[PDB]
Amino acid sequence: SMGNLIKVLTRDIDHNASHFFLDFENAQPTEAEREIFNQVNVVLKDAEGILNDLQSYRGAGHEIREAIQHPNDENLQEKAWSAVCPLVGKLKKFYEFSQRLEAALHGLLGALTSTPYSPTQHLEREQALAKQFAEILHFTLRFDELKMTNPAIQNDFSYYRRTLSRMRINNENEVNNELANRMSLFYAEATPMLKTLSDATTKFVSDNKSLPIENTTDCLSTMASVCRVMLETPEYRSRFASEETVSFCLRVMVGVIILYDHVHPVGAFAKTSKIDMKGCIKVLKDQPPNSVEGLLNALRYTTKHLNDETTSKQIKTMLQ
């Protein structure tokens, strides 16, 4: 049922572009999925506004550089402050939305990693939740791809913190030092949303001591192979691979690979791993470079076991 797993994960997304929530009537969640599907779909619904606010993040680099150049001109200091404050408000909204992804992820993992059923049976029984999990990873990579290309995010927040301290000594919606420290560590990450999801998955394995870790890791590796097989077999490429479906599974694949590398003890590159690392990197390399470079850079730096001595030198050359 490799073909069925592909149709389940890639259903109603060709006729659906740039939407992360699932239509309740179209997804058809079972009675056991209803309470989790509704809660996660509320987060996925708000995920569109988060991504559009990041696409519209213009930055305040122009006003900041003029204020730094003329530091005694209070009009330029107030103009830069008036431009950076609503941008910091967006950054505060992005970080708080990352906390909502952790709550929705626990509900999905708790249902997709039940004790008796296998990973393949879970993705077929809980189709609506399995589809929601892929949408969370789809938004996660798409958010981080934009953040990696926008250097004004860290520059605007760093200027905000420096100005706030030397403005709260000289002369409600403001950001306290405790929240600012967590936000600074959040945006210092290469993939902030993916690092957040990676820690939440490690938390889920830790919170369920009586649950075998394979129920979680083999769930990630199953989804990775579903996307890899469809993208590398022309018999499935001529049947499902569209620009919307390819870009969807490219980001789902890289997402579960990085989660698997942080959760599985030996990592995603070791000889006991279940991820076909060579096959996954090849799929990314066979794509136009401009639409994958953000995903490749995630594998070069965000990963945990890439630079290990156990990791094959063959894939290290692929990732160069």
Author numbering: 0 to 170, 176 to 324
Give passages from the manuscript:
Previously known as FAM49B, CYRI-B is a protein that is highly conserved across the Eukaryota and has recently been revealed to be a key regulator of Rac1 activity. CYRI-B binding has been reported to block various Rac1-dependent signalling cascades in the cell, thereby controlling multiple critical cellular functions including T-cell activation, membrane protrusion, chemotaxis and cell migration. Our structure, the first to be reported of any member of the CYRI family, reveals a protein that is entirely composed of α-helices and organized into three distinct subdomains. The similarity in structure suggests that CYRI-B interacts with Rac1 in the same manner as CYFIP1 and therefore regulates actin-dependent processes by competition with the WRC for Rac1 binding.
We therefore produced SeMet-substituted protein, which allowed us to determine the structure of CYRI-B by SAD phasing. Solved by X-ray crystallography at 2.4 Å resolution using the SAD method, the structure reveals three distinct, entirely α-helical, subdomains and high structural similarity to a conserved domain of CYFIP1. The native and SeMet-derivatized protein crystals have similar unit-cell dimensions and belong to the same ortho­rhombic space group, P212121. They were solved at resolutions of 2.37 and 2.40 Å, respectively. In both cases, a single molecule is present in the asymmetric unit. The two models are nearly identical and could be aligned with a Cα r.m.s.d. of 0.29 Å for 320 atoms. In both the native and the SeMet-derivatized structures, the flexible loop composed of residues 171–175 was too disordered to build and is therefore missing from the final models. This loop connects helices α7 and α8 of the medial subdomain. Biochemical analyses of R. typus CYRI-B were conducted to confirm the oligomeric state of the protein found by X-ray crystallography. As presented in Fig. 2(a), the native and SeMet-derivative proteins migrate as a single band on both native and SDS–PAGE gels. The gel electrophoresis and SEC results corroborate the crystallographic data, confirming the monomeric state of CYRI-B in solution.
